[PDB]
Amino acid sequence: GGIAIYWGQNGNEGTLTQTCSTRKYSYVNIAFLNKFGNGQTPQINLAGHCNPAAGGCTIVSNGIRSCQIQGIKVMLSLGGGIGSYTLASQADAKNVADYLWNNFLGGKSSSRPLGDAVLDGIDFAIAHGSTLYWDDLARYLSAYSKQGKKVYLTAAPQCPFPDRYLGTALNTGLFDYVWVQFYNNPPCQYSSGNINNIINSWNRWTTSINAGKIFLGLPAAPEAAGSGYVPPDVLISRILPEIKKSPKYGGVMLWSKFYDDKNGYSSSILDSV
Numbered sequence: 001g002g003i004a005i006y007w008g009q010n011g012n013e014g015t016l017t018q019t020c021s022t023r024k025y026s027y028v029n030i031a032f033l034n035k036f037g038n039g040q041t042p043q044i045n046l047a048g049h050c051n052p053a054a055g056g057c058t059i060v061s062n063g064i065r066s067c068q069i070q071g072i073k074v075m076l077s078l079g080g081g082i083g084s085y086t087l088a089s090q091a092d093a094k095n096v097a098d099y100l101w102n103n104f105l106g107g108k109s110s111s112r113p114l115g116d117a118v119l120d121g122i123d124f125a126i127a128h129g130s131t132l133y134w135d136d137l138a139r140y141l142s143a144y145s146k147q148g149k150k151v152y153l154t155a156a157p158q159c160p161f162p163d164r165y166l167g168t169a170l171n172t173g174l175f176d177y178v179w180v181q182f183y184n185n186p187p188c189q190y191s192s193g194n195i196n197n198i199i200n201s202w203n204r205w206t207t208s209i210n211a212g213k214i215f216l217g218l219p220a221a222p223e224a225a226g227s228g229y230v231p232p233d234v235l236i237s238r239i240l241p242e243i244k245k246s247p248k249y250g251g252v253m254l255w256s257k258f259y260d261d262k263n264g265y266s267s268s269i270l271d272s273v
């Protein structure tokens, strides 16, 4: 399979162009659009990379196009660990979908946060807030694909199945790629010497929801998460040999680019994914 990487939450992790030119990632999720819904003005946060206000982040279009020409699919990640992002109603879902279309997809806007580049899709990283209307948002976004260009739909649900926020949305069967987060969740993550919980969790995710492919989400380094880190050798010799048996196996997802560099994770596991 391939590796999906999250980019954008640390200005020292390099440009999007450099990130994709490493030839180690097949998918890149731009994190994050952490503010929207309930009447709020949508706002993107790319840490120290750029300031979105006044088109300060429109330069990212160069990276987006550079990645795409390399066959890499780039999605705008909604949510994240921090943010007042939410959906107050089904109408709110429609408004946000149209916003995303005109500002990040095939629509039109005089203030597209990341430039004129057309992202490949939208990533759902909803970890808190509203538990409703996310399935509506998925449906509305998906409906836009009928205009000519496919709007990819991906999701980063917590490993505890089913996911409290993305369960209904994933039940629609509209998602192409689902990278489950097997960390920051003791019941379904790796523990020194024990891979039972993560494997048992993987079996539940691959034998339920209907999506294109399912990925194994992990922290790129011990510092990347509070818990759940899996040493490269363990992943390679114990975990990958098992999860890769599933026909739905898509590969591995990593948080994040910054921590991948400091730990050299993808460089160690790439070929085994």
Ligand SMILES: CC(=O)N[C@@H]1[C@@H](O)[C@H](O[C@@H]2O[C@H](CO)[C@@H](O[C@@H]3O[C@H](CO)[C@@H](O[C@@H]4O[C@H](CO)[C@@H](O)[C@H](O)[C@H]4NC(C)=O)[C@H](O)[C@H]3NC(C)=O)[C@H](O)[C@H]2NC(C)=O)[C@@H](CO)O[C@H]1O
Pocket: 009, 010, 011, 012, 032, 034, 045, 047, 048, 049, 079, 080, 081, 082, 083, 125, 127, 156, 181, 184, 223, 224, 225, 226, 255, 256
């Ligand atoms: C898919 C998913 O849900 N992923 C989870 C991760 O989100 C989570 O990692 C933590 O994510 C939050 C954002 O959600 C991130 O917060 C960011 O922190 C940086 C560093 O302090 C801030 O960057 C600074 O921004 C200011 C302006 O706002 C700049 O002036 C300054 O230069 C920036 N500094 C740097 C170093 O660039 C961001 O502003 C802030 N983002 C937001 C939206 O507020 C945390 O840092 C992430 N923590 C880690 C360890 O990466 C992860 C945690 O394990 O869990 C995933 O599931």
